[PDB]
Structure formats: structure tokens, C-alpha cells
Amino acid sequence: TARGTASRFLTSVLHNGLGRYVQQLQRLSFSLSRDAPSSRGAREFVEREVTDFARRNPGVVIYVNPRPCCVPRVVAEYLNGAVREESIHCKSVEEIAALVQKLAD
Amino acid sequence: PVRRSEKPNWDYHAEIQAFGHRLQETFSLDLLKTAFVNSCYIKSEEAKRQKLGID
Amino acid sequence: LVCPPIQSRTYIPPEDLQSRLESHVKEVFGSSVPSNWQDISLEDVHLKFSFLARLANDLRHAVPNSRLHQMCRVRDVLDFYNVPVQDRSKFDELIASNLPHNLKITWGY
């Protein structure tokens, strides 16, 4: 409901896009599990995509941790100070790639 | 509020390199590393070096 | 009672392969080699065990179980041993793949 939430007016951070575009995503940190099944999609994205994604986006740092963890998550962090959480849990590689590409922009 | 440097994911060299890469500027990394160093950090570093007997 | 050191199974073929294997053909089959030495039939069980044993200890390698259905001429052995096999997983291959500077990976095990 629109009376339930807060609101904001349309805004750019730091008047972005005027002088130059500054891609706002700063760090991206994955946590997968080498052993467990729910991380399957998260694994392949790390093998095939992460390289080319890092080449394409020089600005964002990408941290990747395999750890004994049951729900694979990706934590986006912004130049804004904003932090956004996602579960990549039980998703295909095209689905991980797509999500990360949503976070990016 | 806690320093991102004290939180779980930190690589300072990667951050420094990235910083410059995202604004499309060329810094000798030496000069940029020089740039983020403050007198306060040095004074605290000397406090710790003196009180722990570290050279 | 000793436990021998474990081999790493990382396999690269030696340069002298053709000559090695041909000398192994000569010595194993107890035969003066017919002009095509890579096409001779491996069907005989005696010759098979002998050949693959001496080939096991020269090349420091073993032909795995299932594969033994597929080995008929010597050309098959040539082709099998000409195909390299690493032991390094996707991750060890990844760290060794010359990563971009903006990507930092840690190991949690």
C-alpha cells in the first residue's frame, strides 16, 4: 500500500550523470558452499561469469568466499552507504547473472 | 559505527586501485596511498609502538 | 608395514611416446612387428594384461576400469595416452588463471 510506506522524490546521488556517470555499485560479496547443493548455481556463476563480469566492471570490487554455509547470498554495497542483501539460493546460472546485472546498475 | 577496514571483507590495495579506476583517473598508486595517510593515524601508530614496546 | 607415498595423477605425455610404446609392442607381443604397429589387435587376454602392465609402469599411469571395453587396436592406446588429465579442480584452475585485480578470492576450508 502507498499509505503504508515512506516515499522519496526522484533523486540522483551526488548529482550523478551530470559531469560523468559514476557506476554506483561499490563492492559485491558472494558466499557459496563448495559441498552443498543449494549453491549449485552460485558455483557455476563463479567459474564462468565472474571473470568476464569483473573485466566488464572495473569499478566494483568482487569478494568471493566459499564457506560451510547453507543459503548462498550476495551482498551488494553502495557508494551511497546503502547495503542490499540477496539470496542467489537455488537459482540457475542465467538467473544469477541476471540478478547481478540488476544490482550493477 | 565501525570502520569497513575492521569488517569481514577488506583488501586495501584492491580498494585503492578500484577507486581510481571508477573515476577514470590515472594515479601512481604511491601518491594516492600517500594521499589517504593522516597525521592522526601516524600519532596513534606511534602510541601503540611505544606502549607495546614495538620498534 | 609401510604406507607408500601417494601419486598426484597429474598426467602429461612424454615426448618419446611412439618409440616407447613401439618397443613395448615388440617386447610384449613377443612378435616381430608387422609394418603397421599401431593397428595390431589387442584382443588376446595374455597380451592385454602384459601390454597394459608394462605400459602401466613405464608411463606411471593406469587405464581406468570402464575404458577397458574400448581398447581394441594399439591406436586406441596411443590416443588415450595422448590426452592429458589434470588433478586440479575448478577453483585451483581459477586461482592459476591470472585473475583481474578487482576480484579477490579467499578459501574457507
Query: Which residues, including other chains, have CB under 8 Å from residue C84's CB and lie 6 or more apart?
Result: C11, C12, C13
Hey, what's the cell of A30? 558472494
Other Cβ atoms closer than 10 A to C81: 18
Q: Say which DSSP state C103 is in.
A: E
Q: Give the gap in angstroms from C-alpha A19 to the nearest C-alpha of chain C.
A: 25
User: Residue A26 is which amino acid?
Assistant: Q
The number of domains in chain A is 1
Beta strands in A1-105 (DSSP E): 25-32, 61-66, 73-78, 83-87
**In this complex, do B9 and A59 lie within 8 Å of one another by their Cβ atoms?**
no
- Asked whether the beta carbons of A53 and A100 are under 8 A apart, the reply is yes
Longest CA pairwise span in chain A (Å) = 47
- Asked whether the beta carbons of A92 and A50 are under 8 A apart, the reply is no
Q: Which residues 33-62 of chain C have a CB within 8 Å of chain A? A: none
User: Residue A35 is which amino acid?
Assistant: D
What torsion, rounded to 10 degrees, do the Cα atoms A12, A14, A15, A21 define? -90
b vs e for A43-72, b when ≥16 Cβ sit within 10 Å of the residue's Cβ?
A: bbbbeebbbebbeebbbbbbbbbbeebeeb
Q: Which residues pair with C85 in a beta bridge?
A: C11
Domain span at A90: 1-105
Q: Residue C104: its chain A contacts at CB < 8 A? A: 61-64
C30's enclosing H/E stretch is none
Nearest partner of A62 among A80, A49, A71, A72, judged by Cα = A49
Resolution at which this structure was determined, Å: 3.4
Q: What is the experimental method?
A: cryo-EM
Q: Residue B18: its chain A contacts at CB < 8 A? A: 58-61
Q: Residue B21: its chain C contacts at CB < 8 A? A: 102
Nearest partner of A74 among A83, A37, A34, judged by Cα = A83
Q: Does A51 touch chain C (CB under 8 A)?
A: yes
Q: Any idea which residue has 579506476 for its cell?
A: B21
CATH number at residue A25: 3.40.30.10
Hey, what's the cell of C6? 601417494
CB-defined contacts A:B, below 8 A: 22
**In this complex, do A47 and C99 lie within 8 Å of one another by their Cβ atoms?**
no
Q: Any idea which residue has 618409440 for its cell?
A: C19
